[PDB]
Amino acid sequence: GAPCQVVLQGAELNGILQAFAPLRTSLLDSLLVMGDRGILIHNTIFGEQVFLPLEHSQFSRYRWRGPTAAFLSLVDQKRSLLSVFRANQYPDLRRVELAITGQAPFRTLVQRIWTTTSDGEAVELASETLMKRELTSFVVLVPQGTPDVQLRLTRPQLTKVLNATGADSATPTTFELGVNGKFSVFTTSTCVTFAARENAKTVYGENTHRTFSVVVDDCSMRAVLRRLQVAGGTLKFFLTTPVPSLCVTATGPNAVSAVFLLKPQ
Amino acid sequence: GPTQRHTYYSECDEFRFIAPRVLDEDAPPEKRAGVHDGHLKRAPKVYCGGDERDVLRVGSGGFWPRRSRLWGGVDHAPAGFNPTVTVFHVYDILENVEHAYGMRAAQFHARFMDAITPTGTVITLLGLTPEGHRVAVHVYGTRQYFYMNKEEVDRHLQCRASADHFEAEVVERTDVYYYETRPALFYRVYVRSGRVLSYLCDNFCPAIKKYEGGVDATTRFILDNPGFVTFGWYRLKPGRNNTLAQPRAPMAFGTSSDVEFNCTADNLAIEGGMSDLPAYKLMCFDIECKAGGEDELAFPVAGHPEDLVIQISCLLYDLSTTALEHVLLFSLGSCDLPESHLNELAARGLPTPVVLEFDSEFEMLLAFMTLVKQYGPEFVTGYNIINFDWPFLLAKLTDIYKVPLDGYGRMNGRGVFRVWDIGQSHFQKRSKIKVNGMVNIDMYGIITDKIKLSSYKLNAVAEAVLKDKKKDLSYRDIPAYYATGPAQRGVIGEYCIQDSLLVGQLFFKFLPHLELSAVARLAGINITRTIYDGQQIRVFTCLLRLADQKGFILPDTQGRFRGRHVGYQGARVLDPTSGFHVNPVVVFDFASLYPSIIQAHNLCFSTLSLRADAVAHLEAGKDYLEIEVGGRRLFFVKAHVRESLLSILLRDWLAMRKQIRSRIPQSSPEEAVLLDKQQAAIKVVCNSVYGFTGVQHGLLPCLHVAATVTTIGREMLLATREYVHARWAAFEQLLADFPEAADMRAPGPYSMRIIYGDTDSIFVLCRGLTAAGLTAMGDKMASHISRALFLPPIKLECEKTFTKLLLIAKKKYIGVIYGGKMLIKGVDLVRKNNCAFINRTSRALVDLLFYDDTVSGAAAALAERPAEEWLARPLPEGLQAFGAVLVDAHRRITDPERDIQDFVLTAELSRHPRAYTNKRLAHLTVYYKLMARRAQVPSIKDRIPYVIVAQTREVEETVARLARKLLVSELAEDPAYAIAHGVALNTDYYFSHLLGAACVTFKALFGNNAKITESLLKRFIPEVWHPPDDVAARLRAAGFGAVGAGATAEETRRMLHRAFDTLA
DNA sequence: CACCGATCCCCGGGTACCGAGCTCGAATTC
DNA sequence: GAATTCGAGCTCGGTACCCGGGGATC
Ligand SMILES: Nc1nc2c(ncn2COCCOP(=O)(O)OP(=O)(O)OP(=O)(O)O)c(=O)[nH]1
Ligand SMILES: [Mg+2]
Ligand SMILES: [Mg+2]
Ligand SMILES: [Mg+2]
Ligand SMILES: [Mg+2]
């Protein structure tokens, strides 16, 4: 059909609808970098870099032909290509088609909507079909390589880890990992710690023996993880870089990630 | 000797030597800054080349021409001068009180002394003879008067009948406001010493109604003697019994004229048969000024004794033959005009510059004022001479040098040499200037109402009007030039001379004196009142002539007198059927609409009857119109009962406009353009008759007549719309009325629907007819409608025929006239606001829409959808070229070369900047930034160029110092500054306003939804964003690879693969 | 002292909601 | 006793007027 065709009917739209379900308007004024391997939705929250990979396996049919494409999600700067995938924006949706049609520097994406009716047919709400144009020059700086050590957390665990973190330039935090798993997030007037094994007292992680002490400058790390309203997941550290980075990736059906820049040792 | 002491400097032996120190060649290298000052005792000297002579010594030689006969009493004419004078063009009429005790020695006849016995007012007719002689005829007689109602004054001030300056008589006039009004008995109260009436009209018994107490003595002279004009040939006549003109003796000369007479109105005749204009002289001067203070990059200020005039260009044309006769250059200090400039002058046939050198500023200005008195140019011009040049010079001459200017005009003393500026008077619409017997036609004001430019600087006007690329000297480069030797002062002298030559070229392209003089002849006002005192005195004087003939009198109302509100209901503007109309759109419109209503329906003050008793003895429909105006029933009796006065008034002016238009088809294109502007000026004087009725707290208003004019206008517009819709609704009825419609039936379904209208026009969207002979049939359509509906002077006429029209909004539309030109009507391409960049790109866009087919097809296709349906599906592929222009402008606005003259917005100051209530305007910001920097502060109706400078930390803190998103009135620099300091422009603003102009015009393509248009126009633009500086660095430190611009597609795809696995 | 009219569109600045978000902690739910 | 919609409660832009002013058009 369309030279790039990305089809999300229902029974996969409920997966993606669950991904945007964590209760966010946040990732609306974003940028979608579509291409092979899927759509990547990158946005900046408080100054931090948030990502949502959407693999090609997460659409009913994904076909992409040509160079990577970048769309502002904000269609016409009021509506948004992703406002469709909110929880209850459009109650009765059944299918969404994301067709890109054009020639590499100047492409356009169309997004169609189809809302449910009775007796097996679908109303195309043509008042609300959206058409956006590829950005046609851009650069985004995406996270790279592999983690050296990742630690998986849970919802209350990550909530208390965020609670430990500071408020202002008064309070730098510190994600020290000692020898044998004593992963710990402290500040002057707060400390949290836990053990990492590869009943209730077992977080999981990988390559935990690689001790470190990264140190966080920015208070925003708390705020970001609540804006996203993240429910816990992997906490991956990158230390083979001049400026170390911690990514934090929600462990649910979706992959919304947020990378924060750590100061050295 | 002289009976009237001469108040111009004929002699000086001591004055105030101000002069720069950089003129002093033998003086140490740093004893150069500042100026000299302080008294010096020597007669003021002028150095012309090698020679020198005193400025005020007329004698044998002379460095500038002289047309004066007297000079401080000595009679410098060749002996035996006694020219006979039989015909004498008159260009200005002065009036001045003259006391018979002052003229004991003037040796008049009896019949002038008895006309001034304590005092009289004397009407001086200034002029030329066919032989170049400056005449001055003094018309004795001619006393002002007003009327007061006999009974009203008799009861309000018991009457049973020095005290003889107020001679009175019982006349039988009738008031001009109503048809029911009866001729009462009035007293005609002859004032002399006219000023005294100004007290006795505001102050003597203010509960009586004075009738014509505002009518000056000149108007009594012009009107009381039928035929007389304020500008035209005259002739001395034998007189009532035989009384003759009494040629004065040179000591009794009141003006600087060659010959003078003492006539009365019976010794003068109008002398038609001469039409041509005599040998009158035109001065076209231009001063150049230096600032001599601590900051000599400040703009000169006349009050500061060290901010001095340095140069005065002065060209001396002949007004009739248009020949530049003299090129004078006054110069403080040595001035050697460049040989390149001298040779360009000699090449063009122009006289050689006579550069006059002076030591002191006083000597220069005294020599200029001595030239102005000696040469005595009847007409002066220049560019902005009323806001800068004459105010600078007179400020110098009166504050700094204490020179009386009352004698430097055409009278030898006690004359007016005043300049007036708007200066928060809140009624003055212009800055005036009145030198007596000298007609100052500032070409600035002549050009601002003859051409639409954003900037009216003389370089911009020279390029736009003469197509003459002049080079401008900034007032900032005059210190640096003047400080160097005489050659650089000569370079300044070149730029001064070239300024005045350009202004002479403008004057002789437009010839304002001729057009203005036609208006002054027809109105009854002198030519200086024509230049300056508005439209109401024209109408009032013409109406006063009519009234006084018909036996009426015009009551005085302002004696009983000292936003955006309206006095009555104006005109109907039908709702446009907005859109791109690719079918023919015939524009009918009434010719001289409101004048034709005033004549057709006989509207006046004298024909209105507010009460139905005055017409209780006249038939309805046959003898009087009856109209509900403002909810009030009004009866306007028809002619054959009483002719309107506004009708005959309008006859004269409509004949003038029609004769000017009857010379357009037979003229060159560049002179047809001037003729178009002249007939538009007479159109304005015709519509000001209507406007004069409806001016509240104006001279002689009647908002009943004004509201009737507009009321009948609205009924005529609707009557025309219903006639077109009813009669020609089907094509067969069009074919029955005009059989030539058979060969105009285009294939489609016919219709003829008015799609817009305005005060008079109606835009008939003729579907199914071809545009070819639609104007040929439109003349017949219009004649048919004018015959079926309206009374004879009313005349609907097919004005245009658009093959394409973009009815944007009510007073906005664009359209290409048939087979022909583009007509742009109020869509911001024709507006003085914008910057040349946006105007240029918007014009490119409308040319695409209209001229480029395949964008007109795409645009006409845009209307098959409601606007919002275009938001989803792509615009038809013809609009692609329409977006290339926008894209190009986006590109072209960011590219860093950007001479910022393309980005200069303007706005007119238009009132004292403290008279604003909303004081946060961009041009007001720049006005105060200019006054802060000692720059050239604009004047109340100037246009204030400004750029919108980029939001930078520096500008922000500067604004808070003089005191998120700053307003565009705080990012409001002026372009000279923003070039000097390379502050960079607000690209965000300028592109948002480019799209704003595109959106305002082309929302008509998208069902007039500005938002849908805005969205669809920003779709063309290539969006780009980069992770900002100081951020991509630290992200690149973290091994973040880039995906996008700076890499091959395989690297971007691959590193996204890596990122998707990492970020997973 | 000075002096044509009205209509009308756009745009900038200024105000007032208004709701749509999120957030915050405090009860309600395992 | 750890979690947790819920409901005030705020902020942050729209969106709607709305008034002055520029400056058109009749
Ligand atoms: N007081 C006043 N009223 C004016 C003014 N301008 C318009 N009107 C109103 O217009 C009436 C008819 O419009 P036009 O002048 O185009 O048509 P016209 O006068 O009938 O002349 P033509 O239609 O023949 O060009 C004006 O300056 N002052
Ligand atoms: Mg000049
Ligand atoms: Mg000037
Ligand atoms: Mg007309
Ligand atoms: Mg008209």
PDB file of C-alpha atoms and ligand atoms in Angstrom, chain B residues 285-287 382-385 388-389 499, ligand 3:
ATOM      1  CA  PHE B 285      16.693  75.445   0.464  1.00  0.00           C
ATOM      2  CA  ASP B 286      18.238  72.843   2.755  1.00  0.00           C
ATOM      3  CA  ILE B 287      20.298  73.374   5.888  1.00  0.00           C
ATOM      4  CA  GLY B 382      12.471  71.868   0.465  1.00  0.00           C
ATOM      5  CA  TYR B 383      12.049  68.543   2.113  1.00  0.00           C
ATOM      6  CA  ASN B 384      10.991  68.540   5.711  1.00  0.00           C
ATOM      7  CA  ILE B 385      11.591  72.268   5.934  1.00  0.00           C
ATOM      8  CA  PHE B 388      13.602  70.579  10.731  1.00  0.00           C
ATOM      9  CA  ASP B 389      14.983  73.350   8.548  1.00  0.00           C
ATOM     10  CA  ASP B 499      19.648  67.311  -1.724  1.00  0.00           C
TER      11      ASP B 499
HETATM   12 MG    MG E   3      15.203  69.083   5.953  1.00  0.00          MG
END
